[PDB]
């Protein structure tokens, strides 16, 4: 009598899906292919939409404790401040990835979500079957493909996919704030530090709390010094000398990686009893800082549509129809911003840019008007 769900992927999308379903009385098992539950990418921004998902998941308190809302989101071009934005009170937050992940994992475990590590999904059947790498076949009423950009769940079924890969990437790190050492300034702000001269180098400066600073060091792949890991300290200090104390700390991180990005748009997100959520369905450009935000909204919204008394297959179709346009629009605008380097101008968090952020998944309305 109890509905059973199998979720592939222990990232933000899968954990959100698992918690939301479990709260609604589903028996839920989650599979993570890695040997342990961990989140990579150093730091992350969430906004009102994702904070509302966290509220709905009962995971908000653990997130807000030990995370940070800057006094303002500031943009520089060539060390000149070009904008300071506060989004008319719209809630937002910066945190380490591990901080968000821990909150979600703790909540999943408190609810009794069955979590299997070293467990890899390699195929899904729309009739409600999930196959693991070992050969084990699991039957369920709902299968969730939350297994990231290279989703085997998705690819085992076959979806029409618009794929794009970025030639350029960035190096994302957590370092000590070194706040005292930074001297005079507004070092609690988000500061997006753009430059095109003398070279294309950018740092997104993102405090996570009183102890930890999230840095995104961005340079073209064709730049053999700026794209180097561990970081080429000299070329970063040269263009960002006011961050030297933090950059010296960053240079100690020998695990640093230069990560490129892909985007994904699919003809649909569903097939029978299989739903694709998160990057598996809709990986996007990071300009609007909404990749995980949309992923969490979508995973949460999936649980909502499964409460309507419909068959799982109909609920999944209804879910995509209801919730997908917010993501399609956000993904498109982020792509345009990225292609045009729009954020470099500052003042670009317009009402349209903030549309995904303004969405409240709990009440299903748009809040915090701009």
Q: Which residues bind ligand FAD (CB under 6 A)?
A: 8-14, 31-34, 41, 44-46, 120-121, 146-148, 152, 170, 261, 278-279, 286, 289-293, 295
Alpha helices in the chain (DSSP H): 12-23, 48-57, 60-64, 97-111, 152-155, 233-239, 244-251, 279-282, 291-305, 312-340, 355-358
Query: Is position 291 an interface residue for ligand 5PR (rule: CB under 6 A)?
Result: no
Query: Is position 343 an interface residue for ligand 5PR (rule: CB under 6 A)?
Result: yes
**Least distance to ligand 5PR, CB of residue 134, Å:** 36
Nearer to ligand FAD, 10 or 56 (CB): 10
Nearer to ligand FAD, 77 or 292 (CB): 292
Contacts of 322 (CB under 8 A, 6+ apart): 301, 305
**Least distance to ligand FAD, CB of residue 290, Å:** 6
Nearer to ligand 5PR, 19 or 170 (CB): 170
Nearer to ligand 5PR, 21 or 289 (CB): 289
- Interface map 147-176 toward ligand 5PR (x if CB under 6 A): -----------------------x------
Q: Is 66 exposed, middle or buried, given 0-12, 13-18 or 19+ CB atoms closer than 10 A? A: middle
Nearer to ligand FAD, 70 or 293 (CB): 293
CB 333 within 8 Å of CB 288: yes
The tokens for 361 are 């998944």
The tokens for 155 are 């690819």
Nearer to ligand FAD, 288 or 316 (CB): 288
Q: How many C-beta atoms lie closer than 10 Å to residue 184's C-beta?
A: 6
Query: Is position 289 an interface residue for ligand 5PR (rule: CB under 6 A)?
Result: yes
**Partner whose binding site includes residue 204, from ligand 5PR, ligand FAD, none (CB under 5 to 8 Å by kind):** ligand 5PR
Nearer to ligand 5PR, 87 or 319 (CB): 87
**Least distance to ligand FAD, CB of residue 226, Å:** 16
Query: From its phi and psi, is residue 234 left (phi > 0), alpha (psi between -120 and 50) or beta?
Result: alpha
The tokens for 271 are 């097939």
CB 280 within 8 Å of CB 291: no
Residues 231, 155: Cα–Cα separation, whole Å: 35
**Partner whose binding site includes residue 11, from ligand FAD, ligand 5PR, none (CB under 5 to 8 Å by kind):** ligand FAD
Residues 321, 58: Cα–Cα separation, whole Å: 26
Of the candidates 50, 41, 275, 258, which has an alpha carbon nearest to the alpha carbon of residue 151? 275
Residues 360, 365: Cα–Cα separation, whole Å: 5
Residues 85, 164: Cα–Cα separation, whole Å: 30
Taking the CA atoms of 369, 365, 301 and 152 in sequence, report the sign of the dihedral they define. negative
**Partner whose binding site includes residue 361, from ligand FAD, ligand 5PR, none (CB under 5 to 8 Å by kind):** none
Binding residue count for ligand 5PR, defined by CB under 6 A: 9
**Least distance to ligand FAD, CB of residue 309, Å:** 28
**Partner whose binding site includes residue 9, from ligand 5PR, ligand FAD, none (CB under 5 to 8 Å by kind):** ligand FAD
Nearer to ligand 5PR, 45 or 236 (CB): 45
Query: From its phi and psi, is residue 123 left (phi > 0), alpha (psi between -120 and 50) or beta?
Result: beta
The tokens for 161 are 């996919």
**Least distance to ligand 5PR, CB of residue 199, Å:** 17
Of residues 14, 28, 42, 45, which one binds ligand 5PR by CB under 6 A?
45
The secondary structure of the chain in percent helix, strand, coil, rounded to multiples of 5, reads 35, 30, 35
**Least distance to ligand 5PR, CB of residue 23, Å:** 29
Residues of this chain that interact with ligand 5PR (CB under 6 A) are 45, 170, 204, 216, 286-287, 289, 338, 343
């Amino acid at each position: 009598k109890t509905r059973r769900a199998e979720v592939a992927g222990g990232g933000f999308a899968g954990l959100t899906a698992a918690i939301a379903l479990k709260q609604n009385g589903w028996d839920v098992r989650l599979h993570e292919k890695s040997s342990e539950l961990r989140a990579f990418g150093a730091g992350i921004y969430l906004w009102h939409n994702g904070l509302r998902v966290l509220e709905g998941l009962g995971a908000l308190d653990d997130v807000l404790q030990g995370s940070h809302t800057p006094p303002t989101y500031e943009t520089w071009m060539h060390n000149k401040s070009v904008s300071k934005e506060t989004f008319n009170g719209l809630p937002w937050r910066i945190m380490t990835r591990s901080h968000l992940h821990d909150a979600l994992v703790n909540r999943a475990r408190a609810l009794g979500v069955d979590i299997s590590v070293n467990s890899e999904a390699v195929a899904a059947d729309p009739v409600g079957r999930l196959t693991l790498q070992t050969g084990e076949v699991l039957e369920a009423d709902l299968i969730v493909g939350a297994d990231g950009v290279g989703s085997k769940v998705r690819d085992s079924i076959g979806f029409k996919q618009d794929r794009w890969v970025s030639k350029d990437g960035l190096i994302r790190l957590i370092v000590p704030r070194m706040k005292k050492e930074l001297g005079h300034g507004e070092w609690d702000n988000t500061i997006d530090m753009w430059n095109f001269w003398p070279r294309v180098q950018r740092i997104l400066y993102s405090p996570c709390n009183e102890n930890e600073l999230y840095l995104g060091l961005m340079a073209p792949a064709a730049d053999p010094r700026g794209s180097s890991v561990p970081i080429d300290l000299e070329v970063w200090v040269e263009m960002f000398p006011f961050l030297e104390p933090c950059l010296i700390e960053a240079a100690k991180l020998k695990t640093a990686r230069y990560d490129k990005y892909e985007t994904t748009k699919l003809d649909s997100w569903t097939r029978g009893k299989v739903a694709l959520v998160g990057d598996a369905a809709h990986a996007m450009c990071p300009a609007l800082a909404q990749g995980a935000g949309c992923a969490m909204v979508n995973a949460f919204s999936l649980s909502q549509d499964l409460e309507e008394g419909s068959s799982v297959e109909d609920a999944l179709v209804a879910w995509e129809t209801r919730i997908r346009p917010i993501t399609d629009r956000c993904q498109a605008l982020s792509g345009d911003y990225a292609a045009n380097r729009s954020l470099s101008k500052g003042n670009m968090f317009t009402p349209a840019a903030l549309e995904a952020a303004r969405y409240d998944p709990l009440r299903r309305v748009y809040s915090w008007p701009q």
